[PDB]
Amino acid sequence: LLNMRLRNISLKSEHCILSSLDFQTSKASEQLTKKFIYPQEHNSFLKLNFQEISYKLIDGTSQIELDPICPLKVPLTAFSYDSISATFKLVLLPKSTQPHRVKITLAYELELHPNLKLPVRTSWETSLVNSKLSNVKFKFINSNIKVIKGEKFTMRLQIINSSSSPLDLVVYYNNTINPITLENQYQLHNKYRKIAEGIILLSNDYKIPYFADLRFIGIMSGYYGTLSGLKVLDLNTNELIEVGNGASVLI
Amino acid sequence: YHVEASHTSRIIVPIKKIDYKKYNFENTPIPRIFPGRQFIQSGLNEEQTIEMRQKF
Amino acid sequence: YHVEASHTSRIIVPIKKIDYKKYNFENTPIPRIFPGRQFIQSGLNEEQTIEMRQKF
User: Using the chain's own numbering, where are the disulfide bonds (chain A)?
Assistant: First the structure.
């Protein structure tokens, strides 16, 4: 074995988990072979890695990678092509057969037949927030990453619960500073002074009765990921329910 | 604007600040509508009197 | 128009009449969406059938 490699599959909750095996012909056989080649007056080898594709299942299909693969042949390089893989709905882990081939055109144009094709198990190795009191769940129908200027915009929230008491929630945005190491002492304040100053909710204390279009305008600009001021609350048995979801860039 | 039968509409009225070197906000506080009366002790701390004058 | 949250607003739509010597309103009555079926007796008086045809 010469080309040392690793299998990296990264898991995302946008129903995607990409795969990019990294390869690098490391020093272990290089320290011997590039001194035999140094005795034979060569220090720029070229193993023509040009043929490589993946396999998904028993239907061994070449999945279309997100990146390209031309004739890659140089000395001491290292490559990691990224391939889009569909994320499963559960722990159905598709074992995979990583196939590759490099035709080792050595010094004095000496080709050598070699390939790197083997199989393993391609495990990854690892919107909505639920309630605390009721069966209520909160999601935003409009997409949680959205573009706007400093002007007005429409924002829309899902309320789905059990219809045993299907009512009496209230919103309020609570535009005041949470009053709160010295650089962290002026970091938590500058977090809170742009939470409570950025957007303003133009219909607060909105009685809900499912669907409601909540009404904001934002003043100053930035990335308001998990815009966390707004609090709905159940008027019986008052618990501070929070919706820490959604985002808004203002450029 | 328009408000139908329950629909609140938050009016966003822009103003300026005030300048503390232009008005004195420590003047005779809570002036009575009619002069005179009993003239009883305030029964409050002077600092409290300051913040009551500003908040009025 | 405008209707706020309970306020009815009676729309006053003007039309013309119809002419009884222009349309025949005694044509096949209450036509079925799909042809065929059992073909059971109507079980109603012919005069009643007349006023049901007009009121449809």
Answer: none
